Structures are given as structure tokens and as C-alpha cells.
């Protein structure tokens, strides 16, 4: 804890197309999933943006398999290009996240991202903004940072 | 906090 709203505070400086005010607003994976194209875009592209449902509201069903869509790129880009240098021996609950809003598990997501924009080839440019965060913010990056990198 | 720096600068050098 002291995770998922620190991380979602990083998460606005993405400044995507859909609302990310609150936990709830990315309880349906369109965020994550439009923060991930800006990360990279050549490895989530459109054709893989596509699969994400948009209107989605209430259905926790839909956001589950939206979820579910979202974290299966992850732990493919952490195999794939990453090399698996994103710790993934705890999984976030998607399940949770869908059904009870689980702002915890959220933050375990928001972790794995997190993980990608700090690995990826742009991982200069994201830590140099990180810098220039709230240094409260910027603390809890840190820590995040150092669990995700370890083995 | 100026030694969160380091940390961020730490994980540039890597």
C-alpha cells in the first residue's frame, strides 16, 4: 500500500485519451492499456489496442477480460523484450481488481508497468520525469522500483 | 530528497 495512488499520480502524467482520476477509472484496463502504447508502441500497437474493450462500464466481466488481456502483454514484453528483468513471481489479482475494485491489487498492476517504462528502450526519459515528481511520490517509485528489479 | 537522485541516477548508470 501507499502504492496504487502514487502510482496512479504517475500514471497522469501519461496523459491518455480515457479518464484516470480515480482507482475506479482503471479498474477496465483502457488506461493501462493506452499507457502501455505510449511506452511502446512498436510492441503494443494498435492491432493489440484493439483487443482492449472501450465503454465498458459496470461489467465487471468485461474488465476482468480486458484485465486479463492487458497483464497477458505484460508478461509477454517482460519475456519477449525485456528479458525478465520485471519480477512477475506474485501476479496482480485481476479478478479483485474487477470485482471488489481492489486498489491493492491495482497497485500491484500499476507496479508492472511501472517495471516496463523503467526497462524499456525510452527508460531514460521515464526516470528523468520521474525526477521531476512530487518527492513523495518519487519515493514510493523508488521502492517499487527496487522490488520489481530484484530476483 | 536529494539521494532519491541517486537511486534514479544509480539505475541511468546500470
Redesign the interface.
Known amino acids: 500500500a501507499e502504492l496504487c495512488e502514487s502510482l496512479l499520480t504517475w500514471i497522469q502524467t501519461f496523459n491518455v485519451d480515457a479518464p484516470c482520476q480515480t482507482v475506479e477509472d482503471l479498474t477496465n484496463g483502457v488506461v493501462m492499456a493506452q499507457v502501455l502504447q505510449k511506452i511502446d508502441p512498436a510492441y503494443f500497437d494498435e492491432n493489440w489496442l484493439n483487443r482492449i474493450k472501450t465503454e465498458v462500464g459496470d461489467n465487471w466481466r468485461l474488465k476482468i477480460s480486458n484485465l486479463k488481456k492487458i497483464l497477458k502483454g505484460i508478461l509477454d514484453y517482460n519475456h519477449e523484450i525485456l528479458g525478465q528483468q520485471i519480477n512477475d513471481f506474485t501476479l496482480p489479482d485481476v479478478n479483485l481488481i474487477g470485482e471488489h475494485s481492489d486498489a491493492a491489487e491495482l497497485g500491484r498492476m500499476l507496479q508492472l508497468i511501472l517495471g516496463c517504462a523503467?526497462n524499456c528502450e525510452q527508460?531514460?526519459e521515464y526516470?528523468q520525469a520521474?525526477?521531476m515528481m512530487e518527492?513523495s511520490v518519487?519515493?514510493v517509485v523508488?521502492t517499487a522500483?527496487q522490488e520489481l528489479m530484484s530476483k | 530528497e536529494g539521494v532519491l537522485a541517486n537511486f534514479f541516477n544509480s539505475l541511468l548508470s546500470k
Open positions: 523503467v527508460k531514460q526516470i520521474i525526477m518527492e518519487q519515493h523508488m522500483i
